[PDB]
Amino acid sequence: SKKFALTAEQRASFEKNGFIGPFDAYSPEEMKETWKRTRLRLLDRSAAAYQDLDAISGGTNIANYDRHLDDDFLASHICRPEICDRVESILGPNVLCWRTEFFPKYPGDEGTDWHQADTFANASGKPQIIWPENEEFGGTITVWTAFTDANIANGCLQFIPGTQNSMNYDETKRMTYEPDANNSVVKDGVRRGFFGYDYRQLQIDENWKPDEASAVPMQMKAGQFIIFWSTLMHASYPHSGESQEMRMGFASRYVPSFVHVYPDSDHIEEYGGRISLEKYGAVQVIGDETPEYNRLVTHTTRGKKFEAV
Ligand SMILES: CCCCCCCCCC(=O)OC[C@H]1O[C@@](CO)(O[C@H]2O[C@@H](OC)[C@@H](O)[C@H](O)[C@@H]2O)[C@@H](O)[C@@H]1O
Ligand SMILES: O=C(O)CCC(=O)C(=O)O
Secondary structure (H helix, E strand, O other), X not given: OOOOXXXXXXXXXXXXXXXXXXXXXXXXXXXXXXXXXXXXXXXOOOOOOOOOHHXXXXXXXXXXXXXXXXXXXXXXXXXXXXXXXXXXXXXXXOEEEXXXXXXXXXXXXXXXXXXXXXOOOOOOOOOOEEOOOOOXXXXXXXXXXXXXXXXXXXXXXXXXXXXXXOOOXXXXXXXXXXXXXXXXXXXXXXXXXXXXXXXXXXXXXXXXXXXXXXXXXEOEOOOEEEEEEOOXXXXXXXXXXXXXXXXXXXXXXXXXXXXXXXXXXXXXXXXXXXXXXXXXXXXEEEOOOOOOOOOEOOEOOOOOEOOOO
């Protein structure tokens, strides 16, 4: 009954395909203006949850994590009813935003590798989210918002429909780090990579390949968002550099509050080091009940409440 709830037909399509949308959070004009201001603000990490990131060596997107914990706009964004009423339709009455991540594609950048994520296992094989072990559910609902236009030419997302119910990768396997890939590694005809790593190295079967012939593009205008299971096969196109503007996506990740977030961990464990979770918490964006085993925050590190404005 909530204003932006998924219709029954949208809920059915989400169940079949593993994604639904795009939907509008902002007009393109509002998004363009907001991102202009926000991009400049984010250069200042003085209030960021994670400090001393220079101690983490090798490949890591950690600098793009969890800026909602310090930023005024992002703190509202993760709580937008346009997003949350739809996540509620899938995840129920009590839901946490446990992770956010920026995905820049600069002109010429490689496409994101085909991947699925279920446990979000850390460097030591330890899951960062755990669902009830007596049940068959896994992963997180990803809401990917286009902070810029997202088109094939600048590296929009792509999905293989209906692949969210079986994992092709083992997140406890180890990838090797390539500092000098130069966005140049061609994988079945497409430049792809994973932050210096190769997600193919996580495959359960080394000889298996994604059903890329069945991939579908997801072009989006600035201010739109797409909702998908992290367990769905997903990737992005390369940025051809035809446009000299970078593409920016912002992912917010949601789990029901009964899911254990960073269980038995006081750090994000990357290949190159540990990042303290001292100033981390999950944000309760829907409902008001969460079990005590999940650490919550109610405000950013600059005292801005997590609520939609
Ligand atoms: C009071 C209301 C509380 C509601 C809590 C939210 C429940 C959502 C569960 C879900 O759909 O999870 C789907 C995830 O689990 C996966 C893992 O493969 O699916 C499993 O769940 C089942 O959904 C009932 C099956 O359809 C699939 O075969 C699948 O294995 C993927 O579809 C997703 O990652
Ligand atoms: O923006 C991208 O290129 C990848 C996004 C993604 O993999 C995700 O949010 O799950």
